[PDB]
Design an enzyme around this catalytic site. Structure first.
Site, PDB file in Angstrom:
ATOM      1  CD  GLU A   1      -3.132  -0.733   0.114  1.00  0.00           C
ATOM      2  OE1 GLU A   1      -2.995   0.348  -0.549  1.00  0.00           O
ATOM      3  OE2 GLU A   1      -4.023  -1.566  -0.128  1.00  0.00           O
TER       4      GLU A   1
ATOM      5  CG  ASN B   1      -8.657   6.471  -4.011  1.00  0.00           C
ATOM      6  OD1 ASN B   1      -9.057   6.684  -2.857  1.00  0.00           O
ATOM      7  ND2 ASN B   1      -7.669   5.673  -4.313  1.00  0.00           N
TER       8      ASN B   1
ATOM      9  CG  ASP C   1     -13.773   7.761  -5.288  1.00  0.00           C
ATOM     10  OD1 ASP C   1     -12.707   8.342  -4.971  1.00  0.00           O
ATOM     11  OD2 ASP C   1     -14.419   7.012  -4.508  1.00  0.00           O
TER      12      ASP C   1
ATOM     13  CB  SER D   1     -11.805   9.378  -2.120  1.00  0.00           C
ATOM     14  OG  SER D   1     -11.462   8.215  -2.823  1.00  0.00           O
TER      15      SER D   1
ATOM     16  CG  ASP E   1      -6.502   5.134  -0.804  1.00  0.00           C
ATOM     17  OD1 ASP E   1      -7.659   5.449  -0.543  1.00  0.00           O
ATOM     18  OD2 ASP E   1      -6.161   4.031  -1.326  1.00  0.00           O
TER      19      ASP E   1
ATOM     20  CG  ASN F   1     -10.902   5.590  -0.091  1.00  0.00           C
ATOM     21  OD1 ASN F   1     -11.242   4.796  -0.982  1.00  0.00           O
ATOM     22  ND2 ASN F   1     -10.985   6.878  -0.259  1.00  0.00           N
TER      23      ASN F   1
ATOM     24  CG  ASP G   1     -16.071  -2.762   6.923  1.00  0.00           C
ATOM     25  OD1 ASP G   1     -15.859  -3.936   6.506  1.00  0.00           O
ATOM     26  OD2 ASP G   1     -15.832  -1.733   6.270  1.00  0.00           O
TER      27      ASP G   1
END
Ligand SMILES: [Pt+2]
Length: 129
Positions: A35, A46, A48, A50, A52, A59, A101
């Site tokens: 990562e 990202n 979209d 967003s 990280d 994110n 989650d």
């Protein structure tokens, strides 16, 4: 801060990630490697809109507020900049919520594609833990 492999394995163990939700320490070290390359300052945009953040590339779409991700959540209740500290406490606490989650470590694209199903014990070989 760019952690060494065994220094990060030790910090993650101290902070209670070894076998957190049944994920061995080597899964977490492998995820951080692919990562962030073990760099607490890593940031990546990202598609979209967003971003990280940090050693585990958390994110802004769901987990933190970076002030520029419209219609996003802040489920870890932190500024995304908290996740860039040389101290991994905030990243580890937020990672524990993420992995709990229901999706487990599949939330980390690099874990799913590069660590899942591999000999992750190799990531902690030689380390004093
Ligand atoms: Pt901790």
């Amino acid at each position: 801060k760019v952690f060494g492999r065994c220094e990060l394995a030790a910090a993650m163990k101290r902070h209670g990630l070894d076998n957190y939700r049944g994920y061995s320490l080597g899964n977490w070290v492998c995820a951080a490697k692919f990562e962030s390359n073990f760099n607490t300052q890593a940031t990546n945009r990202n598609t979209d809109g967003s971003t990280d953040y940090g050693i585990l590339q958390i994110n802004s779409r769901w987990w933190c507020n970076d002030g520029r991700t419209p219609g996003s959540r802040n489920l870890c209740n932190i500024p995304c900049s908290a996740l860039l500290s040389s101290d991994i406490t905030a990243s580890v606490n937020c990672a524990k919520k993420i992995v709990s989650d229901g999706n487990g470590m599949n939330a980390w694209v690099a874990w799913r594609n590069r660590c899942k199903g591999t000999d992750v014990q190799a990531w902690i070989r030689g380390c004093r833990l």
